[PDB]
Amino acid sequence: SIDVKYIGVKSAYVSYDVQKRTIYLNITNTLNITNNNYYSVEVENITAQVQFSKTVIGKARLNNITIIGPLDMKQIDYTVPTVIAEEMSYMYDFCTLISIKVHNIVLMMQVTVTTTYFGHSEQISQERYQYVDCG
Amino acid sequence: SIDVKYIGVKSAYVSYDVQKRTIYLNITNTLNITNNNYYSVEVENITAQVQFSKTVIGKARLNNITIIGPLDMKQIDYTVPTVIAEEMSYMYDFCTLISIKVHNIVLMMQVTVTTTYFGHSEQISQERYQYVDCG
Amino acid sequence: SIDVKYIGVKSAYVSYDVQKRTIYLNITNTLNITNNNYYSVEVENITAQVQFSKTVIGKARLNNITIIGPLDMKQIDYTVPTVIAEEMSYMYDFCTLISIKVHNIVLMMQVTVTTTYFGHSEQISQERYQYVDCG
């Protein structure tokens, strides 16, 4: 929640890149760095009171105070029908990266049906580093 | 929750890269670094009171105070029918990375049906580093 | 929850990379580093009171205070029917990485149906480092 960085190739604080037919003679680098980070995050001071019926007296009557009624969820529900009378295929793959009719699903329910959660919740996802190299 | 970095190739603090036909003569590097990190996160001071009926007196009556009624979930429910009368295939793969009709599913329920959770929850996922190399 | 890093190739603090036809003569590196990390996380000071009926007196009556009613879950329920009258296949794989009709499922329920959880929960997942090399 401070630096969520998606970096393509490289990351550094001090970086020297010398490439591809160069000449680099008798140089004099001198760094006098002072890099201090003082993080102080999420310092919370909470004080909560969550009653549904506080101090009910005197011949009263309550009924259906908190109703979360009929609930229905259908998160991922899809249909891929296929009717073919005749089919032919010819794949001639080389040094490649194929994916045919796969189903890549990721689901993350952190705090589902509940009551009176305190504190801190956190979900992170970063997946499928795929790669192909040839020479 | 501070640095969630997706870095493609490399990461460093001080990095020297010298490549591909260079000459690098009698240089003088000198680093005087001071890198201090003082993290202080999530310091919480909580004080909660969660009653459903606090101090009910005097010939009263309660009923159906907290109802989380009929609940239905269907997270991943999909259909892939297939009707074929005649089928042929020819794959000639080489130095490749194939995936045919696979089903890659990941599901993570951290705090499902519950009541009065305190503290801290955390879900992390990073998967499927795949790779193919040839020469 | 501070550095959740997905790094593709390499990680370092000080990194020297000298490759691919270079000349590197009589250099003088000198590092005077001071790298201190003072982590102080999740320092919590909790004080909770979770009653469902605190101090009920005086000829009262309660009923159905906390109902989590009829519950149904169906996490992963999918159908892959297949009807074929005639089928032929020819795979000629070489130096490759195939996957046909597999089912890779991962499920992690941390805190399912419960009541009054305190403390800390944590789920981590990172799987399937696959790889193929040829020469």
From Swiss-Prot, chains A, B, C:
Keyword field contains Lipoprotein: yes
UniProt-annotated location(s): Late endosome membrane; Lysosome membrane; Cell membrane
GO cellular component, as recorded: endosome; late endosome membrane; lysosomal membrane; lysosome; plasma membrane
Regions annotated as coiled coil: none
Mutation effect (residue 94 to A): Decreased number of infected cells by SARS-CoV-2. No effect on infection with HCoV-229E
Positions of disulphide bridges: 95-134
Any one GO MF annotation of this record: ATPase binding
Expression sites (tissue/organ): Expressed in the brain, including in the frontal cortex (at protein level). Expressed in lung epithelial cells.
Keyword Phosphoprotein annotated: yes
GO biological process, one term: regulation of lysosome organization
Residues carrying covalently attached carbohydrate according to the record: 26, 32, 45, 64
Ranges facing Lumenal side: 1-135
Protein origin, superkingdom: Eukaryota
Keyword entries, A-Z: Amyotrophic lateral sclerosis, Cell membrane, Disease variant, Disulfide bond, Endosome, Glycoprotein, Leukodystrophy, Lipoprotein, Lysosome, Membrane, Myristate, Neurodegeneration, Phosphoprotein, Signal-anchor, Transmembrane, Transmembrane helix, Transport
Subunit: Can form homomers. Interacts (via N-terminus) with MAP6 (via C-terminus). Interacts (via C-terminus) with the vacuolar-type ATPase subunit ATP6AP1. Interacts (via N-terminus) with AP2M1 and CLTC. Interacts with TMEM106C.
Function, as annotated: In neurons, involved in the transport of late endosomes/lysosomes. May be involved in dendrite morphogenesis and maintenance by regulating lysosomal trafficking. May act as a molecular brake for retrograde transport of late endosomes/lysosomes, possibly via its interaction with MAP6. In motoneurons, may mediate the axonal transport of lysosomes and axonal sorting at the initial segment.
Family according to the record: Belongs to the TMEM106 family.
Disease note: Frontotemporal dementia 2: A form of dementia characterized by pathologic finding of frontotemporal lobar degeneration, presenile dementia with behavioral changes, deterioration of cognitive capacities and loss of memory. Gestural apraxia, parkinsonism, visual loss, and visual hallucinations are present in 25 to 40% of patients.
UniProt name for this protein: Transmembrane protein 106B
